Amino acid sequence: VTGSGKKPWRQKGTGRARSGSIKSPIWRSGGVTFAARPQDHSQKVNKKMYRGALKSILSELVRQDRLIVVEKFSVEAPKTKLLAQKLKDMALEDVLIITGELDENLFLAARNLHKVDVRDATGIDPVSLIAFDKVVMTADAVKQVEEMLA
Amino acid sequence: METIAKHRHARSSAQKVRLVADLIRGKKVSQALDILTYTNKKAAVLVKKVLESAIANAEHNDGADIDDLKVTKIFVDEGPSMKRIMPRAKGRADRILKRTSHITVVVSDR
């Protein structure tokens, strides 16, 4: 805290409770007692625990029937209207669509729908898999996921 | 019909003005004006001005007659106080509260 190290008043004889610095955490405009600093909040997950968590999440998705497997999933042109029409045809609203190959047209189409996300095979994560209501797997994505999970 | 006149931030203390207000509380307006004429207090002067204003309000704004008016309510509240310094012996400073008060007079017939 900006201030000086001068004792505010002499130790004895003033009649006031003794003080030694204007920057005391008791005082108004004094410092914080245990002031927080930039700290690293990340935690370690063992690789086998991460893989077990993904396997359990995928097994539960199959068990509650929130995982739809399709053979091919693409759009002709990057039109969000076209993608929204195709998802309303499939009767899906809140959907995570995993695709084996990163498709520019599909990514540009789904960039603006906030309940629809499009992911590549290698970039799935437990929070997204749990949070999104339906998950749509292409066959190539199924192969890649089962390969990386072993 | 109750008619109200207030004098706010009056440069006087609430205790002294309460002495005068409690002197005239509940009387008829003519008796109150005689009492406030012949009371020797600065608060009596202030309260008399408020009371005459209240009577004029009851005439002009609501048509009430003087001969029916009584002082139904009168009360003095504490207003904000100006803080001053009085320098004392041996470097000590003392604070002076130059007190104010709000004087309210309610006159009516019933």
Binding site: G13, T14 | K90, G91
Partner: peptide
């Protein structure tokens, strides 16, 4: 500051 009867010595040292 301080009172003179607290700085004084004859009345402060009253019971040695």
């Amino acid at each position: 500051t301080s009172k003179w009867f607290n700085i004084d010595n004859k009345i402060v040292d009253h019971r040695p």
